[PDB]
Each structure stands twice: as structure tokens, then as C-alpha cells.
Write a protein that binds this ligand. Structure first.
Ligand SMILES: [Ca+2]
Ligand SMILES: [Ca+2]
Lengths: 529, 158, 23, 82
């Protein structure tokens, strides 16, 4: 009826469909086709119907006699989630939220991957014409159900990407030091021979990633040096190293723009996906601080203040560099949990600040606004040290305040040290036990993202990254089926075996044995008399 | 089979250090440096002697667990060192390479003590840096003390 | 009603009855 | 025109609303009294009593508000005070 500007027909149906699964179902039913004509993907529309209609077992049996399963089920869970906040009846909302289809899909993939791991990975990568020639990966993304990544095979394919074509530690590091392809001819591998082998040794994700940490580390050090002594008056020489740093900073900015702008349907959607990342937000605010401080050389009168701005930006970038250590297997979940507890400790420290303010107020004026204020502030600062310079109070007593100072001091130490600390180990255990798998998901997730980014990162260094972007801009301005079906059949048979197995298991259920035996014995008793 | 044992490796490196320092008497000009080498070797042998206490029934598993957590705390302390370097860098030059460098190093060292000698900053304010110093100080204490510690009890229970 | 222990009890009664009536 | 009056009643009658108002007022009075104790706790010249009496009278008003919240919620005055 909104499009008008029963009543609905296939037109509005396809409209709403393409509205939810945007790239999955762009243009079904090419404003209406011959309704008499038979279907193309019947079971597809069947499962879609049952999903929209919320007919669990129906869609189940439809999926049974269907093809291209895992992706279908992924989309299924996606749209189930879609039709959760758009529900009015609360109980019906929970029912809809009780899909559990992701479990089905994970079961399917675990099953198929339990054999032909290579063919399984291939399946995970195969395009999907049924879902508009698309990638099950992207399907899961649009689903955003992290558990989709929970399977071991997920990490398997991710890793096979990660360690490069030479997948096969510190040996690899020493290799990264000097280009010894002969050492690579002894370490691992998998006239133009040397050129192709160099391409093989350079195209690896971990390779360019170590290159990037090297470059970022070096630029951090160099900028620290520039802030140490090269943040000089507006003589030109001072600007020399300064401009050398700042120009490259702008190059880094261009690299970030590239990584975040040319990955898109809508420029609005592109910028949204960009602003999604918190770390990209850190990058943006860091460059904001740097560009703000860039006014320092403009105003040599404000050169020192702009320098302080640059120092803040330095702190920002320093914190940013720390983002990488989470990539480690063991350190990963640690940093994840650290990120988790970020919110509560803030408010806790706010309360601690309130308490300290109260203590210092109660102490200072009761004891004895600049000279007397600065001393009070110093006493508050020395609270952490615990110097407790009550000499003046003792002299005054030589009195009615020292006892209260001691009482309040003792109880403050008690409350802070005990509660504000031991309270944290509770949240630590809570984030540990199950949120450790949750953060394993989170870590694998950021891991997927970093792997894509490094793969998405051009196989180039920061210096020639400008040359790579120039080549891209110049190129811009200048302007199977049998195997597919075979693996499809493989998946189908896999699904059939899986279901037969599940039901075989359901048959021998001990409770089912109880029920059948009860029926048989009541029958024997009745027939006997 | 010999090089298999880590403790035999400690023995070997200890004797390596001792034989290296044995050049001290050879070069009385380098007698003090060789003596320092011998001091290092002394530290080695001292740590080595500690190997025995694990033989105890109750103390055994304790020392074992201690040996277990040896790897992770190293990297954790490396991260802590990075953070401290960041803090000291952000503080020193923003506040005020030998005389001004030594003072900065001393401030970094006093970080563990927590003296927090922001008197100079206060004088300067009498300013736009004391608030940020306090913010970063507080959050650094928070992150280090809380996480770098409570993270360890998890591995302890494991 | 469907309590498993109740099932045990009812089945025990029925089987003892079958055994007794059989002999 | 009464639409805005009724809508203001709707936006003001909320519990969280008056509650945030109360935390604001208490916070402000804490700060002001802290200031008065800092430098307005002065000798018995009248001016010193000025801010002092301004604080103390309102303190008595707060006392009356507490008496109201705790006295007119009762079967027995004894049960009420209990
Ligand atoms: Ca980024
Ligand atoms: Ca030995």
C-alpha cells in the first residue's frame, strides 16, 4: 500500500525481500512475470515462505529436499533475527528468537568438513547462484552470528590464508630480516624462478603484516624523536624533519582512506561500515588531533600549545599501536577481556574520585585560595603514596581531629582496597568462564577482519604505497559448473547421512525405550486379563 | 640427551660465564670488568641452587606451576614496559639530552614508588598538563594493577 | 503423571502381576 | 494551547525525572555547603551569617521535607515512627 502512490502481490514481496537480504536477493521475479510459468528455484521460495510464515518443521522438510544448504540456512537465521525487533507479540517475539538455525548450519559444515577438508574449504568459498552468485562468507557476515566462525574449519581456512602460500617462527622472522631465498629453499616453500619465488615469499599476509608493524614502530620512534627536539621554532630547517614526518603522516592518511573507502553499494553504507570499527574511530580522532596540532607551525606564538596538541596525538597513536598484540593466540583473549571490563572500572574510579574528594575536603579546611589550596591539593595527591603528613595535626593536638583522621583513613583504606579490588575478580571470572569462548569468538572475529585487511592491504610497502595508489588512479583514469555440481551432490549426500544419523540416534533414545516398553507391558497385562 | 635438560643448560651457561670472567686475572686492566662477569656468573649459580627446593612434597607442585607461568609473564612485562615508556615520553618532554634526560629517567624509575613529583607542573600551571597527567596516571594504575594482575590468577587456577 | 519413577512403579506392578498370573 | 501544559505535566511527572532533579539539587547543595565551610564559616559578624543562614534555613527546609516523607505516608503514630 505504501508502494501504491488482498492488495499485495509478488512485486511488494520481492521489494521487501531485497530490502532485508540486500545483496542476496536483489532482483527475484523479473512489473510481474508470467504467473502461470513454473518456478526456477521452487524449494528456495518454499523455505522463504516458511521462514516468513514461521513454520519451523515445514522449512525443515523443505531444506531437506533442497540444494545449496549451508548458505540457505545462514540467510534463514539472518532473516529470523530480522523478524525479531519487528514483532509486536512478546511471546511470539521470543518464539521467533528461538530459531536455532545457526546450529543446523554449523552441524552441516562440521559434518561435511569431517571429510575432504580441502573440498570442504572449497565449499566454504564456492559462489552461490541460488543466493545471487554470492559468498557464504558474506552471508554469515550479513548474519553477524559470531558462532558461524566457531567451527574449527573456520580457523582452518583462516589460517591457510594467514601463514601465506608458504604456510608450512623465529626462523621465519630471521628470514624476514634478509632476503635469503636459499634459506627459504631450506626453511619452507610451497631466471624468472626467483621472481616468482619472491612473489611467493612476499604475498603472504603475515609477511606484509610484520612489515607493517616494523614501519609503524619505526615511524613512532622517529616522530617521538621529532617531538623531542625537532619541534623547534619556525625556522625552515626545523620544518625540514617536521615536514618530512607530516607529509608521510598525510600519506598514511591516504592509505587509511584507501583501506576504508574502496572495499560498496551505498557511499552512506560504506561510511557506516567504516565508522563501525572502534579502531578506525581511534585512527580518525588521532588524525584529527594531528591536524589540529598542525596549526602549531602556522602560529609560532602558539607553537608550544600546538606542540602539546601533537603530544596528545602522540599518546593517541601510542595507545593505538597496542591494538596489535591481541593477535596472539594466548594474549588474544587476555586483551579481549581487558577490553570487556573497560566500562565498569571507569565508573568505579569515578566513585573512588568522589571518595577521595570527600576525604581531602574533610581534612584540609578542618586542619587549616591558593597557598592553602595548593598544599591541600598536594596532600590529596600524596594520598596514593600514603605519606600521611599529620605532623601539623599532631602539633595542633599538643588534637580532636587526629582520631577522626585515623578512623576515616582506616575505613577508606578498607573500603577502597578491599571492595574496589575484590569486586573486579568477580567480573574477571565472569568474563573468563564462558565469556572466554565469547571472546574467543571475538578474537577469531577481529582475526578474520585483520586477515582480510592484510589480504586487502596491497602487497606493497609504505614508501611505494603512494606509487600503488598512483597506479590505481591511473588505471581508473585510463578507462566449474561440473565441479560445482559434483561438490553440491557431495554436500547433499552429506546432509542425508547427517539426518539419517540424527534420527538413528533419536530412535535408540533411552526415554523412547521406556515409553515403548511401557506400552508393550501394558499391552501384555491387558491381553493377559 | 645431555642438552635435553634445561638445568644442565643452566650449568653449561654458568660455566661459560665463569670461564669468560676467568680472563679477569689475565688482564688486570680488565680485572674489574671480568669481576663483573664473575658477578653475573654468581647470580647464575645462585639461581641454579634454587632448583633443589622443588624436591619437597608440598613445595614441588608450587615450583612446578611457577616454572609453567614463566613464558606469559615475560610478554606481559614487555607490554608493561611499553606502556611505561609511553607514559614517561608523554610526560617528560611535554613538561620540560643528558641533564634533562637523566631527570626524565629518574621520574620513570620513581613510577613504581609513585612519588609523582608534579611540583614543576603545578608551578607551570600557576597548568593544562596536570589534568591530563592525572587522567593518564589514574587509567594507567587502573589497567596495570587490575588486568596485568587478575589475569594471572586465571592462569594460576588453570 | 508421566514421572519416570511412577513409570518404574507401574511397570514393576504390572510385571509382578504378569509373573504371578503366569504361575 | 493546553497541549503544551499537559505535555509538560507528562514530561515532569516521571519518577526518573524528579529523581535526576533531586540528585542535581543535592549535589549543588553539597557543593555550596562545602564552599560555605571553606570560607563562609566566619566570625559572628552578620555578613558571615548571611550565606550561613541562607544554607541553614534551606537545611531546615530539607528537614521539613524529610519529616513530610517520613510522617504522612498510618494506623498508629507509634507504628509510623517505627
Ligand atoms: Ca584502521
Ligand atoms: Ca647438572
Amino acid at each position: 500500500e505504501e508502494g501504491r502512490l488482498p492488495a499485495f502481490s509478488l512485486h511488494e514481496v520481492s521489494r521487501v525481500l531485497k530490502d532485508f537480504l540486500h545483496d542476496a536477493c536483489r532482483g527475484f521475479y523479473q512489473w510481474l512475470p508470467d504467473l502461470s510459468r513454473k518456478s526456477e528455484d521452487p524449494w528456495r521460495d518454499l523455505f522463504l515462505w516458511a521462514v516468513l510464515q514461521n513454520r519451523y518443521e515445514m522449512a525443515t522438510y523443505f531444506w531437506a529436499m533442497g540444494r545449496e544448504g549451508v548458505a540457505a540456512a545462514l540467510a534463514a537465521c539472518k532473516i529470523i533475527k530480522e523478524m525479531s525487533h519487528l514483532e509486536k507479540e512478546a511471546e511470539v517475539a521470543r518464539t521467533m528468537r528461538e530459531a536455532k538455525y545457526e546450529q543446523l548450519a554449523l552441524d552441516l559444515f562440521s559434518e561435511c568438513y569431517s571429510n575432504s577438508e580441502d573440498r570442504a574449504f572449497a565449499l566454504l568459498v564456492r559462489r552461490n547462484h541460488s543466493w545471487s552468485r554470492t559468498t557464504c562468507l558474506h552471508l554469515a557476515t550479513e548474519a553477524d552470528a559470531k558462532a558461524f566462525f566457531a567451527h574449527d574449519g573456520v580457523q582452518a581456512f583462516l589460517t591457510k590464508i594467514w601463514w601465506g602460500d608458504m604456510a608450512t617462527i623465529l626462523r621465519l622472522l630471521g628470514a624476514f630480516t634478509c632476503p635469503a631465498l636459499i634459506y627459504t629453499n631450506l626453511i619452507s616453500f610451497s631466471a624468472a624462478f626467483l621472481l616468482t619465488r619472491w612473489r611467493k615469499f612476499w604475498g603472504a599476509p603475515v609477511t606484509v603484516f610484520l612489515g607493517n608493524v616494523v614501519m609503524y614502530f619505526a615511524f613512532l620512534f622517529l616522530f617521538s624523536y621529532v617531538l623531542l627536539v625537532d619541534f623547534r621554532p619556525p625556522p625552515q630547517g626545523p620544518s625540514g624533519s617536521e615536514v618530512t614526518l607530516y607529509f608521510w603522516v598525510f600519506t598514511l592518511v591516504l592509505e587509511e582512506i584507501r583501506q576504508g573507502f574502496f572495499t560498496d553499494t551505498r557511499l552512506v553504507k560504506k561510511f557506516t561500515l567504516y565508522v563501525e570499527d572502534n579502531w578506525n574511530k581511534c585512527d580518525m580522532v588521532a588524525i584529527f588531533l594531528f591536524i589540529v596540532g598542525v596549526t602549531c607551525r602556522m602560529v609560532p606564538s602558539v607553537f608550544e600549545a600546538g606542540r602539546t596538541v601533537l603530544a596528545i596525538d602522540f599518546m593517541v597513536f601510542t595507545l593505538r599501536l597496542i591494538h596489535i598484540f591481541a593477535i596472539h593466540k594466548q594474549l588474544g583473549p587476555k586483551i579481549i577481556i581487558v577490553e570487556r571490563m573497560m566500562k565498569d572500572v571507569f565508573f568505579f574510579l569515578f566513585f573512588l574520585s568522589v571518595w577521595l574528594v570527600a576525604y581531602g575536603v574533610t581534612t584540609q579546611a578542618l586542619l587549616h585560595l591558593e597557598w592553602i589550596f595548593r598544599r591541600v591539593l598536594y596532600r590529596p595527591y600524596l594520598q596514593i603514596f600514603g605519606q600521611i603528613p599529620l605532623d601539623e595535626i599532631d602539633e595542633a593536638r599538643v588534637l580532636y581531629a587526629n582520631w577522626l583522621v585515623i578512623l576515616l583513613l582506616v575505613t577508606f583504606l578498607l573500603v577502597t582496597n578491599v571492595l574496589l579490588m575484590n569486586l573486579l575478580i568477580a567480573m574477571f571470572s565472569y568474563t573468563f568462564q564462558v565469556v572466554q569462548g565469547n571472546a574467543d569468538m571475538f578474537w577469531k572475529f577481529q582475526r578474520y577482519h585483520l586477515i582480510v585487511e592484510y589480504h586487502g592491504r596491497p602487497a606493497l610497502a609504505p614508501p611505494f604505497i603512494l606509487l600503488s595508489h598512483l597506479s590505481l588512479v591511473l588505471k581508473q583514469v585510463f578507462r566449474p559448473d561440473p565441479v560445482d555440481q559434483k561438490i553440491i551432490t557431495w554436500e547433499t549426500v552429506q546432509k542425508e547421512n547427517f539426518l539419517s544419523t540424527m534420527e538413528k540416534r533419536r530412535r535408540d533414545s533411552e526415554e523412547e525405550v521406556l515409553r515403548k516398553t511401557a506400552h508393550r507391558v501394558d499391552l501384555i497385562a491387558k491381553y493377559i486379563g
